[PDB]
Design an enzyme around this catalytic site. Sequence first.
Site, PDB file in Angstrom:
ATOM      1  N   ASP A 163       0.820  -1.212   0.000  1.00  0.00           N
ATOM      2  CA  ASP A 163       0.000   0.000   0.000  1.00  0.00           C
ATOM      3  C   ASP A 163       0.857   1.267   0.000  1.00  0.00           C
ATOM      4  O   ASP A 163       0.760   2.106   0.900  1.00  0.00           O
ATOM      5  CB  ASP A 163      -0.941  -0.004   1.193  1.00  0.00           C
ATOM      6  N   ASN A 403       6.958  -7.051   6.933  1.00  0.00           N
ATOM      7  CA  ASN A 403       5.709  -6.363   7.251  1.00  0.00           C
ATOM      8  C   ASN A 403       4.554  -7.179   6.685  1.00  0.00           C
ATOM      9  O   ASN A 403       4.535  -7.482   5.489  1.00  0.00           O
ATOM     10  CB  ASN A 403       5.695  -4.937   6.686  1.00  0.00           C
ATOM     11  N   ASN A 458      -0.412  -4.999  13.633  1.00  0.00           N
ATOM     12  CA  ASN A 458      -1.094  -4.023  12.784  1.00  0.00           C
ATOM     13  C   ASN A 458      -2.572  -4.357  12.890  1.00  0.00           C
ATOM     14  O   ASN A 458      -3.026  -5.342  12.300  1.00  0.00           O
ATOM     15  CB  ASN A 458      -0.649  -4.124  11.327  1.00  0.00           C
ATOM     16  N   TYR A 460      -6.689  -2.807  12.775  1.00  0.00           N
ATOM     17  CA  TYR A 460      -7.540  -1.683  12.399  1.00  0.00           C
ATOM     18  C   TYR A 460      -8.964  -1.865  12.915  1.00  0.00           C
ATOM     19  O   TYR A 460      -9.934  -1.706  12.159  1.00  0.00           O
ATOM     20  CB  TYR A 460      -7.524  -1.492  10.873  1.00  0.00           C
ATOM     21  N   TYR A 464     -11.063  -0.808   8.961  1.00  0.00           N
ATOM     22  CA  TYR A 464     -11.394  -1.948   8.108  1.00  0.00           C
ATOM     23  C   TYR A 464     -12.317  -2.934   8.813  1.00  0.00           C
ATOM     24  O   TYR A 464     -13.289  -3.405   8.226  1.00  0.00           O
ATOM     25  CB  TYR A 464     -10.117  -2.664   7.667  1.00  0.00           C
ATOM     26  N   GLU A 495       0.832  -0.416  13.946  1.00  0.00           N
ATOM     27  CA  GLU A 495      -0.070   0.243  13.008  1.00  0.00           C
ATOM     28  C   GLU A 495      -1.489   0.196  13.542  1.00  0.00           C
ATOM     29  O   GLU A 495      -1.992  -0.875  13.898  1.00  0.00           O
ATOM     30  CB  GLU A 495      -0.035  -0.401  11.624  1.00  0.00           C
ATOM     31  N   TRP A 540      -0.408   4.731  12.610  1.00  0.00           N
ATOM     32  CA  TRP A 540      -0.199   4.723  11.172  1.00  0.00           C
ATOM     33  C   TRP A 540      -1.145   5.747  10.579  1.00  0.00           C
ATOM     34  O   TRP A 540      -2.350   5.702  10.851  1.00  0.00           O
ATOM     35  CB  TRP A 540      -0.459   3.345  10.591  1.00  0.00           C
ATOM     36  N   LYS A 559      -4.341   8.152   6.248  1.00  0.00           N
ATOM     37  CA  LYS A 559      -4.324   7.788   7.655  1.00  0.00           C
ATOM     38  C   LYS A 559      -3.300   8.572   8.454  1.00  0.00           C
ATOM     39  O   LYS A 559      -3.071   8.240   9.622  1.00  0.00           O
ATOM     40  CB  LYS A 559      -4.066   6.291   7.808  1.00  0.00           C
TER      41      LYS A 559
HETATM   42  O1  LIG Z   1      -4.195   0.119   5.061  1.00  0.00           O
HETATM   43  C1  LIG Z   1      -3.331   0.925   5.537  1.00  0.00           C
HETATM   44  O2  LIG Z   1      -3.553   2.183   5.627  1.00  0.00           O
HETATM   45  C2  LIG Z   1      -1.985   0.363   6.042  1.00  0.00           C
HETATM   46  O3  LIG Z   1      -2.243  -0.880   6.822  1.00  0.00           O
HETATM   47  C3  LIG Z   1      -1.385  -2.067   6.604  1.00  0.00           C
HETATM   48  N1  LIG Z   1      -2.159  -3.137   5.882  1.00  0.00           N
HETATM   49  C4  LIG Z   1      -2.650  -2.650   4.624  1.00  0.00           C
HETATM   50  C5  LIG Z   1      -3.317  -3.697   3.747  1.00  0.00           C
HETATM   51  N2  LIG Z   1      -4.280  -4.571   4.444  1.00  0.00           N
HETATM   52  C6  LIG Z   1      -5.578  -5.081   3.883  1.00  0.00           C
HETATM   53  N3  LIG Z   1      -6.353  -5.939   4.756  1.00  0.00           N
HETATM   54  C7  LIG Z   1      -7.454  -6.305   4.041  1.00  0.00           C
HETATM   55  C8  LIG Z   1      -7.927  -6.601   5.322  1.00  0.00           C
HETATM   56  C9  LIG Z   1      -9.185  -7.184   5.096  1.00  0.00           C
HETATM   57  C10 LIG Z   1      -9.710  -7.516   3.807  1.00  0.00           C
HETATM   58  C11 LIG Z   1      -9.042  -7.288   2.591  1.00  0.00           C
HETATM   59  C12 LIG Z   1      -7.771  -6.828   2.953  1.00  0.00           C
HETATM   60  O4  LIG Z   1      -7.643  -6.693   1.591  1.00  0.00           O
HETATM   61  C13 LIG Z   1      -7.058  -5.322   1.456  1.00  0.00           C
HETATM   62  C14 LIG Z   1      -7.488  -4.725   0.267  1.00  0.00           C
HETATM   63  C15 LIG Z   1      -7.088  -3.419  -0.073  1.00  0.00           C
HETATM   64  C16 LIG Z   1      -6.244  -2.694   0.817  1.00  0.00           C
HETATM   65 CL1  LIG Z   1      -5.719  -1.031   0.411  1.00  0.00          CL
HETATM   66  C17 LIG Z   1      -5.835  -3.299   2.023  1.00  0.00           C
HETATM   67  C18 LIG Z   1      -6.171  -4.608   2.394  1.00  0.00           C
HETATM   68  C19 LIG Z   1      -3.773  -4.956   5.786  1.00  0.00           C
HETATM   69  C20 LIG Z   1      -3.256  -3.747   6.608  1.00  0.00           C
HETATM   70  C21 LIG Z   1      -0.022  -1.803   5.904  1.00  0.00           C
HETATM   71  O5  LIG Z   1       0.998  -2.123   6.819  1.00  0.00           O
HETATM   72  C22 LIG Z   1       0.229  -0.428   5.381  1.00  0.00           C
HETATM   73  O6  LIG Z   1       1.198  -0.406   4.349  1.00  0.00           O
HETATM   74  C23 LIG Z   1      -0.999   0.196   4.872  1.00  0.00           C
HETATM   75  O7  LIG Z   1      -0.718   1.436   4.258  1.00  0.00           O
HETATM   76 CL   LIG Z   2       5.456   1.162  13.067  1.00  0.00          CL
HETATM   77 NA    NA Z   3      -4.772   7.460  11.496  1.00  0.00          NA
END
Ligand SMILES: O=C(O)[C@H]1O[C@@H](N2CCN(C3=N[C@@H]4CC=CC[C@H]4Oc4ccc(Cl)cc43)CC2)[C@H](O)[C@@H](O)[C@@H]1O
Ligand SMILES: [Cl-]
Ligand code: NA
Lengths: 589, 589, 589
Positions: A163, A403, A458, A460, A464, A495, A540, A559
């Site tokens: 990302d 990561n 990490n 959320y 998410y 994160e 993050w 973010k």
């Molecule tokens: O997201 C963020 O801001 C930051 O969080 C961390 N991760 C990003 C992607 N992650 C995802 N997890 C999903 C989690 C659940 C379902 C589908 C998933 O499929 C996707 C699809 C699109 C995107 Cl964009 C992200 C994801 C896990 C968290 C990274 O360390 C950062 O580099 C990043 O920038």
């Molecule tokens: Cl960190």
């Molecule tokens: Na934030």
Amino acid sequence: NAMLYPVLTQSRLLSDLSGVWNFKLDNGKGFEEKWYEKPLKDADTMPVPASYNDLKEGTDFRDHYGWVFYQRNISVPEYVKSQRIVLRCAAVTHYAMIYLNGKLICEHKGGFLPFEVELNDDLQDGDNLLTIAVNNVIDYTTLPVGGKANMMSGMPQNNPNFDFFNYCGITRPVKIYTTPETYINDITVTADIDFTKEEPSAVLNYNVEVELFDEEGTKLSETEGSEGTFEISNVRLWQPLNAYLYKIKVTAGQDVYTLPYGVRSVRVDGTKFLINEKPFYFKGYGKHEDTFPNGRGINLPMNTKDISIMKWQHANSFRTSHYPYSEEMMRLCDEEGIVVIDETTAVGVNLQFGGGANFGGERIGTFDKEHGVQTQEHHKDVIRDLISRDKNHACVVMWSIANEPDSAAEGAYDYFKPLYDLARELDPQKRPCTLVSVQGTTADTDCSSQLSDVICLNRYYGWYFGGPDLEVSETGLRKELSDWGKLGKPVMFTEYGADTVSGLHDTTSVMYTEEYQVEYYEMNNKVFDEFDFVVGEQAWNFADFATSQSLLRVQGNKKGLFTRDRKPKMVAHYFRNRWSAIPEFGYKT
Amino acid sequence: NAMLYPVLTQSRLLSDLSGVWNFKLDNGKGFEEKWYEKPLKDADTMPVPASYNDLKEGTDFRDHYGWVFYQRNISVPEYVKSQRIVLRCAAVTHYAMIYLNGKLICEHKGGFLPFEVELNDDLQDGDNLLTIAVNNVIDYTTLPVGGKANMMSGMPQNNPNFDFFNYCGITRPVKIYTTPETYINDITVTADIDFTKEEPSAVLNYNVEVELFDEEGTKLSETEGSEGTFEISNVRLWQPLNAYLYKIKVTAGQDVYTLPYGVRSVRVDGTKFLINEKPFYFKGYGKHEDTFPNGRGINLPMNTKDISIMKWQHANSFRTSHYPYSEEMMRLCDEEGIVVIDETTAVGVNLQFGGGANFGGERIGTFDKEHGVQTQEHHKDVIRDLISRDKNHACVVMWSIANEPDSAAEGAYDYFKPLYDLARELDPQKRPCTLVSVQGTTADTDCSSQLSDVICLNRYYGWYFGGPDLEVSETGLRKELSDWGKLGKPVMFTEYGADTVSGLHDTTSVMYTEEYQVEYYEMNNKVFDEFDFVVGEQAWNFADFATSQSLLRVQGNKKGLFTRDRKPKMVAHYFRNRWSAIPEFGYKT
Amino acid sequence: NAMLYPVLTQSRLLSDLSGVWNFKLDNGKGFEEKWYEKPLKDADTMPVPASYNDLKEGTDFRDHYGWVFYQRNISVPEYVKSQRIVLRCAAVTHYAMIYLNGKLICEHKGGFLPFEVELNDDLQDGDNLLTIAVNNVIDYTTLPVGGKANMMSGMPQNNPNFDFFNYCGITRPVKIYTTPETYINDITVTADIDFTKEEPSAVLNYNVEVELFDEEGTKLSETEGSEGTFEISNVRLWQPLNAYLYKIKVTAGQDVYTLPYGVRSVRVDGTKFLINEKPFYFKGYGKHEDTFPNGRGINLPMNTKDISIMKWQHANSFRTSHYPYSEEMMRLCDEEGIVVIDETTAVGVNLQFGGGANFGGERIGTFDKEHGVQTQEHHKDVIRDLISRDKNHACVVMWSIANEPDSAAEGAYDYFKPLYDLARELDPQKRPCTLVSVQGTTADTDCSSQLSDVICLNRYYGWYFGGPDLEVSETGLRKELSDWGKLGKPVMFTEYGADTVSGLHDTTSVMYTEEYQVEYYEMNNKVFDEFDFVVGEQAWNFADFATSQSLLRVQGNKKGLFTRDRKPKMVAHYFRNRWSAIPEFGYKT
Ligand SMILES: O=C(O)[C@H]1O[C@@H](N2CCN(C3=N[C@@H]4CC=CC[C@H]4Oc4ccc(Cl)cc43)CC2)[C@H](O)[C@@H](O)[C@@H]1O
Ligand SMILES: [Cl-]
Ligand code: NA
Ligand SMILES: O=C(O)[C@H]1O[C@@H](N2CCN(C3=N[C@@H]4CC=CC[C@H]4Oc4ccc(Cl)cc43)CC2)[C@H](O)[C@@H](O)[C@@H]1O
Ligand SMILES: O=C(O)[C@H]1O[C@@H](N2CCN(C3=N[C@@H]4CC=CC[C@H]4Oc4ccc(Cl)cc43)CC2)[C@H](O)[C@@H](O)[C@@H]1O
Ligand SMILES: [Cl-]
Ligand SMILES: [Cl-]
Ligand code: NA
Ligand code: NA
């Protein structure tokens, strides 16, 4: 193998080649037409160091796939040829191919760690044509990993399995420096440090492949030989938010080199992270090397401004998500006393994103040995080069092997075990090692529960997973965090965050507003404070940064606590007020 | 006197000292305590090159009054001492005081033009302590001029008599380069160019205090002696938005130097500005050297991005409001073919702003010989140093002696006449000279009607004067512009604009919205197009930039077509569409 | 059945009950405790008309599930009891339950069309307690349709199967008006109109369940009887962007009523949409009844401001996405001459969103007769009530039976056929009928190819499908649009757009910037102009509007050409410039 940071010394030059160079995008014929032999025709201009993606206009330029060609003349006076003439590329993202006078004289893979090449031969007298070709292709053999579609898939171009934006070109400076024909190649300094005394003292074992000074410059000791020791009574400890760098001037035959060194100790004990045998608490962020318009290109003014902003916010640490940062920022954290979690280029080793990779109908698991990631042989080189570069930084407190990899999947433990072992083998300080864990792993399933001294999450909950229901997301976070306490290890969050477009508000918050972002961190932080084995919060991200385009990304990742130009959102004042009432040591004991 | 741009050559080194230095604000005791002799205690960190104002937090730091102290160790191997060792400060804003090993070895006044000092003596062997002290005080003896209150007055600190922020510190790089003990000190190249032919040819008179090449590198001629000539049949003309740089390799005794040169001609004829004997029309902006967080500090990525943005917008020129820009940006305009109006540091030579300066009840006029500006002796040095530095740039098309001085006041003509004469004496190309005229002057009153080959106006009809009534402001603009046509000289607008906060809109526009800014430029441009002696429009400004705080300044000057991070406001697409239908040559003849 | 708009007349009162009322959220006990009998205890305040969701603070209030209780005293003097006393609720969203003095006297389902109840009985003398209970629950029996999860699912609370916020409460005014005991209940006026003449004339068949005037008020004819006719030589045609309303004063026994009427004709002919036998082209938008803080509540100032903004932008039409608008806005479009596509509440009749509804493992198809939508019996009432209300509006040019239903699915044709038939049965003007088609349907599969006189598409080539690749998305759009031409019917786009956060920009655009939104519409519009059977463009949306929270929604839907406070984004000036060069009639013939 060994990369000492080039500096002006009594025996070493330092001719920075940074400036505007010639530049041309490859059209697919650059190699058969052999552009690296003759000066570039119909050329464009491009400053180095910098990522090139944002420095011209047009989607065809920004989203270019493949090779680019830098070029520049270099000339050394012949009285310098008596010394060594080495050309040190601080970073070339992703794949470099250095030609000189038309002859290929170096290659390198991995776009975030330094590499050099000797120039004594092939260096004619007069004007020499230096060409650097740069490739941006990412796939299953690269770190970071490139996928086969966008990360939002399933919900000729590169598709990051990460990302952030695939900024490429000569990311960090290209310099020339000299050494005598018998030179220092490496220096290693460890510190055994006696705390039984009321006035602690230290013993500094070194090893050169020698004089000591203090902060001002007063000489304090001397010793002969390649290996030796220094004994400092009443030693001054390097500490978080209170640095102190000794100076080590190592004189060998016809060559001198000076290296700053900070005296401190790092030790895990149960559910406690100890720096100088005190119980530390991480305050800070995952960062990026991301600015405008430099892209990933090094920006020393922003580094100082970011560090100022940190001390303004009462932060004390950050991680180098998701690649090793520039040497200059590492030395700066030494001077400014900022705790760093050094992380490799190993993001995207996780084939459950991007929709997925499929074979004969079945989905490819991450560590499928024939259709999955082909990165471990290179993953090892990165751990080797990164620890060789940053071994002496008192600010580097723990290593991060990857990561969000497929930490809880078949083949995972066998993939990471040799990397973790290699990390502890080569780090003379035997520093903590970790892995930053994707959401979805549990204490039982995560192969980091075995391999890692610190659990880095990490999570959320409230973005998410659960947003916009912060009440529900709270009991989710408490339920998973409770179960992590059973490992008796330290747990920190590397994160957590919510996308926030600066300027959006409601008194009754909704997602993407500044109010929601603050409420999100309030809920998360409330649960963190309930568990004495949580030893760190890192938000993050520090600042809004660029990514590939997608429905889920409002002109980049939003973010950040600050905007891309480092202006604070409301959450940045929230954290500043919280982190002001939270100490560096003994937060809760 | 002569400042050739330091480059890597077959006989010259180039050790850029740029990086993080030691740094301390003076508290008033730095000189009696002699901090420049011993390393700085309780020091801070600061990267060079950069303005320091925005790089730490706190109004006491940003608005600091007085001195700051940079410091850094330097070391040369002794085999280099056989050559000359000169330390070239590309710019130090405002007043520099260079100590070496505790001994004062240089001083300089004027914070935007280069200056050097020899280091062969005073350069011990080993580690040398190099200290640079920087002063920011502005007053009636400085260029730019500092007043006694804010510019909004009448409607211990510096008070700029200019509308931009007083960014100070080591603005441009500090480098070290070598020459042999008999060296080239200057090069001068003029071009007499024959247009009677269908395939025009050229004659290149040079003068060294010698080989020719083309764009690729093919050698085309050679000549002996300090003075000589080159004859190029079918010569390739440097042109706006279509550059072409020949290469000139001047070999002297044990020293070589290469200088790019563009072949073009500049000539005023009646109401026509002629480049290569064609009728030119200026499209572009007054710029600033202003970025975040560098302040005024040089930013090569932004320079390339600004120039990209220009070619995206179909601009062709800018003026270096209100100081000479960096050498790198000048060479870049040579490569990219961007027309430059080179302007001195002479802003604020006009004591009718800032409320005013009063004596025994009576107000001090600008050029009062005992209580007014004390700047002419220095004003002359600037014209000398600026023309010596930029004499060879094919992009430098006209000189600007001052920005908005008291052009129509007692003492004005006697103040500017020797400066204008000095400008034409020392410019071997005899290029046009001008002065950028404050609002309020007329053709009769403005002393620029006599001295200047081109009339450059700064007019804000529809902002300061007339806003928000664009109808009334139109007939004001037509009435003054008509009267300017009687001089039979070319007239261009170097400044026009309206403050616009990005994001503010109304379908029925009010001031400060993006709609109003577009309507403002529509009204102005409509009147420009009515007069065949108007040969140029340059908007103010290219981008939002920082100023001193005041009721009239919404976080800086907001008159930019782009934001400070170079993102376009709606007006930037308006101008792009207009400038697309307007050629560089023969707009209206 | 019949709903004439209440007006002050010579025989009818009009006591608007709008103001601040008493208000209480139900906690689940409001009915067993019978709050509608006694005045509300611990009451809150709430103005009617308005949606209540945004008018207090707190997520529990905004996201409230279930019932609310309005209350207010009403009193009529007894000399008025000789007439009829009817209470007309212009709209109550979603389900209304009107009590008077504690007695339930009306119920209504459907929250966007009027309904009334007689008050002669149950109306004591003195102060009467009027309670209105309002329910917001949506499910498979409601129009709009409520799902079982968020629309983003699969990628106790209501979950809209529609992309807007579930604003509820007394959306439109509550008024009281009187009639004599023998009253007019309905009026119907059709127009047969003779174009063979050079000066066209008209015949106005009416039908009351009678005098004619012109715009000023001059009487022009009279006739007796319930059914009759008017013959107007040199009749003035109501036209787009050029309205003209005759006045029709229908005097019956002891009761008078006046109704404005516009004379125009609407006829489909091949690939041509004909208004007054001229080839029309739609310019405009899908709108919402969405303002701050009224929510869906009626806002007459915004209606006038929106219509002003339209005429400023050279629009001529909009659709009432996705519900019938207020009577006042309909009469306004009559006065201002704005073409309206009248649409029912039938959004979300499409169970392929929201992840989906599942039964025994198998997914429920939309029109599953036992586990799918239960809406057709009510869907018919809406078509009946909507056409009875708006039958006489010269601005209502075509009916829209539903927005994005499962048009190409099993059971679809059998679901819509009786609705389409019912629409043509009851519309005395026999106006065109349509259905606004989800993305994914083709000419072959869409059951609208059979039932509809006009093909209305919602297509997001370059946003949901293809973004950010506008080149690829273009050939997608051309390929589907070509195939639609084979029906020989008229095709218009009722929705196309890209989310754009006001203020975000790049010279090299990315998604969510104002530049991208403009480029998106440029690409789409280029393809529209290639096909003579495309007879209309309507952007989505007119203005940013509120939705339920989700990752995909940056504080609401941001696809508006204007912001929620009606300030223009850059695209609004793009469309204004395009629509200025495009006529209302004979665009391409
Ligand atoms: O997201 C963020 O801001 C930051 O969080 C961390 N991760 C990003 C992607 N992650 C995802 N997890 C999903 C989690 C659940 C379902 C589908 C998933 O499929 C996707 C699809 C699109 C995107 Cl964009 C992200 C994801 C896990 C968290 C990274 O360390 C950062 O580099 C990043 O920038
Ligand atoms: Cl960190
Ligand atoms: Na934030
Ligand atoms: O203003 C701008 O944006 C740009 O325009 C040019 N000039 C600025 C100051 N000028 C003023 N003219 C006044 C004109 C009329 C009455 C009082 C005047 O007193 C003030 C007071 C405060 C300020 Cl702030 C400006 C002035 C003249 C125009 C400069 O070249 C730019 O550097 C500047 O940035
Ligand atoms: O979207 C918009 O701005 C406007 O466009 C129209 N429709 C919206 C939903 N549509 C979706 N189509 C998907 C299309 C492809 C894959 C999944 C789909 O699943 C989702 C999931 C979440 C959301 Cl939010 C939308 C959709 C179809 C287009 C409506 O008329 C408007 O009321 C609306 O506001
Ligand atoms: Cl200018
Ligand atoms: Cl529509
Ligand atoms: Na402007
Ligand atoms: Na849109």
